[PDB]
Design a protein around this ligand. Structure first.
Ligand SMILES: O=C(NO)C1(CSc2ccc(Oc3ccc(Cl)cc3)cc2)CCOCC1
Ligand SMILES: [Cl-]
Ligand SMILES: [Cl-]
Ligand SMILES: [Zn+2]
Ligand SMILES: [Zn+2]
Length: 267
């Protein structure tokens, strides 16, 4: 497809799920060859794996003392829409979580796409690779289309679930929300995270219970969300990606490990 930017500046704002602080974003159009980058306090932070500074419970980027938490959801939306040139100006320390999904970003950006003059140079996975960490595994292999499967093995009523995204089915993952298990919330708070988390932006589950009165958006909403997170982390390769991926229990740390291995291989 063609390289794309946005037709005009787009703004979003709200609390961040980890910092609990209110932040604002301004998405700026950019010319061909710019890539996706964040901008904070005069510093440009490219949306690339070299700038990752944290991967426990979110993917965070930094450069020159400026950090931005929780980039995975906005990057996943930009990857799905194949927006390739944009500056995401952040006034604050984290991307707003909004309702926990990519919906508000997706609906706004999709109506404001500007096609540009050259075609995208995709990051094309050249050969099969497997990355692993303590029972968690991610495999990547060649494909002319982006295809991403996530399989979960939950320690509650959900049990085993799998979901596969293929191109054309973007609408099936952009409404799936971030989620948390009630038994894990104390740890998240104790490590200085989850300060903005609530039932308004997170699907919270117990061993048997669903805390959210509105329930699940889909019976497999958590694995749809994990596919969505992986698509955001894959955009840290620095170009939209063509490959077939399978993640068994992967999280941001393993997703970033895969990206760094693929980037090294194809240097
Ligand atoms: O979506 C994600 N990454 O993008 C995950 C974020 S984990 C995460 C867990 C809990 C939090 O705080 C909360 C504190 C209290 C409440 Cl009531 C609600 C939430 C905040 C964050 C989930 C999928 O696995 C990868 C990590
Ligand atoms: Cl941690
Ligand atoms: Cl994680
Ligand atoms: Zn932790
Ligand atoms: Zn997420």
């Amino acid at each position: 497809g063609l390289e794309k930017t946005v037709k005009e500046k787009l703004s979003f704002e709200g609390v961040g799920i980890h910092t609990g602080e209110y932040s604002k974003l301004i998405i700026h159009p950019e010319k061909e060859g710019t890539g996706i980058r964040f901008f904070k306090n005069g510093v440009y932070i490219p949306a690339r794996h070299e700038f990752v500074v944290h991967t426990n419970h979110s993917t965070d980027l930094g450069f020159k003392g400026q950090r931005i938490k929780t980039v995975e959801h906005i990057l996943s939306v930009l990857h799905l829409l194949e927006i390739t040139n944009v500056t995401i100006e952040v006034i604050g320390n984290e991307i707003p979580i909004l309702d926990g999904s990519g919906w508000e970003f997706y609906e706004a950006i999709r109506k404001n796409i500007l096609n540009q003059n050259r075609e995208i140079d995709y990051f094309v996975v050249e050969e099969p690779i497997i990355v692993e960490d303590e029972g968690r595994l991610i495999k990547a292999e060649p494909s002319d289309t982006l295809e991403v499967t996530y399989e979960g093995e939950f320690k509650n009523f959900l049990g085993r679930q799998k979901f596969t995204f293929v191109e054309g089915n973007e609408e099936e993952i952009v409404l799936a929300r971030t989620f948390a298990f009630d038994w894990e919330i104390e740890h998240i708070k104790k490590v200085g995270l989850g300060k903005g988390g609530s039932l308004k932006n997170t699907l919270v589950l117990g061993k048997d219970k669903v805390y959210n009165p509105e329930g699940l958006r889909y019976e497999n909403e958590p694995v749809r969300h994990k596919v969505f997170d992986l698509i955001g982390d894959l955009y840290l390769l620095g170009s939209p990606v063509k490959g077939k991926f399978y993640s068994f229990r992967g999280g941001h740390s393993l997703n970033v490990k895969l990206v760094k291995e693929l980037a090294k291989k194809q240097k």
